[PDB]
From Swiss-Prot:
Whole sequence portion shown: 342 to 372 of 871
Family statement drawn from the similarity comment of this UniProt entry: Belongs to the krueppel C2H2-type zinc-finger protein family.
Descriptive protein name: Zinc finger protein 473
Domain notes: The C2H2-type zinc finger 2 to 6 are necessary and sufficient for discrete Cajal bodies localization. The C2H2-type zinc finger 5 to 10 are necessary and sufficient for interaction with LSM11. The C2H2-type zinc finger 2 to 8 are necessary for interaction with the SLBP/RNA complex in the histone pre-mRNAs. The C2H2-type zinc finger 2 to 10 confer activity in histone pre-mRNA processing.
Span of zinc fingers (C2H2-type): 13-35
Biological role: Involved in histone 3'-end pre-mRNA processing by associating with U7 snRNP and interacting with SLBP/pre-mRNA complex. Increases histone 3'-end pre-mRNA processing but has no effect on U7 snRNP levels, when overexpressed. Required for cell cycle progression from G1 to S phases.
Location in the cell: Nucleus
Subunit structure of this chain's protein: Interacts with the SLBP/pre-mRNA complex but not with SLBP alone. Interacts with LSM11 in a U7 snRNP-dependent manner.
Length: 44
């Protein structure tokens, strides 16, 4: 339909931490909270 390439994004929001998909934008915002695992290779 004479569409324009400009625009490479999915209709859903993916998580670059657990590879999970979400429907609501705000839903992912909070989900990312549990992904606040600051690098800690020196943790017993
Ligand atoms: Zn995630």
């Amino acid at each position: 339909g004479s569409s324009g390439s400009s625009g490479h994004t999915r209709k859903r929001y993916e998580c670059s931490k657990c590879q999970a998909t979400f429907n609501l934008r705000k839903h992912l915002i909070q989900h990312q909270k549990t992904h606040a695992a600051k690098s800690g290779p020196s943790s017993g």
